[PDB]
Design a protein around this ligand. Structure first.
Ligand SMILES: *[C@@H]1O[C@H](CO[C@@H]2O[C@@H](C)[C@@H](O)[C@@H](O)[C@@H]2O)[C@@H](O[C@@H]2O[C@H](CO)[C@@H](O)[C@H](O)[C@H]2NC(C)=O)[C@H](O)[C@H]1NC(C)=O
Ligand SMILES: *[C@@H]1O[C@H](CO)[C@@H](O[C@@H]2O[C@H](CO)[C@@H](O)[C@H](O)[C@H]2NC(C)=O)[C@H](O)[C@H]1NC(C)=O
Lengths: 50, 50
């Protein structure tokens, strides 16, 4: 869930809401190809659509 | 078109500028999926593409 830090406004995540980062860190939740759409309903699997 | 709240700089909107919302309200514009490409040139109908 994503919410304003000031105001609790829980919300589902968005693909555009995120940015890629060069390096992972130990605090990043582990995730897989299949899991990412589960976390992000907005995900687009180009490999599968192709 | 989307433009600054402060001033007038209109341009076509992008799905990247939008977000899901839990609750619809009667103020919201009724819309159809085929209108999404019409409303947003940046929308993609994933199901039909599949
Ligand atoms: C998320 O992943 C990082 C990266 O570690 C790898 O992936 C993990 C799922 C696990 O298989 C690690 O053994 C892999 O090395 C995790 O960071 C690891 O943390 C453990 C804790 O002791 C450490 O032994 C590993 O060396 C770390 N991995 C590194 C440094 O590459 C992390 O714990 C995973 N989970 C979360 C919630 O971030
Ligand atoms: C969009 O669709 C909704 C759902 O039908 C419309 O909401 C209705 O509005 C009328 C107007 O008084 C109410 O009587 C109904 O109770 C509403 N139904 C709901 C909220 O489920 C809405 O008018 C349509 N148009 C717009 C611009 O939202």
């Amino acid at each position: 869930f994503v919410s304003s830090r000031r105001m609790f406004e829980p919300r589902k995540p968005t693909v555009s809401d995120f940015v890629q980062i060069e390096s992972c860190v130990v605090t990043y939740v582990n995730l897989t190809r299949d899991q990412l759409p589960d976390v992000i309903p907005d995900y687009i699997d180009v490999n599968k659509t192709r």
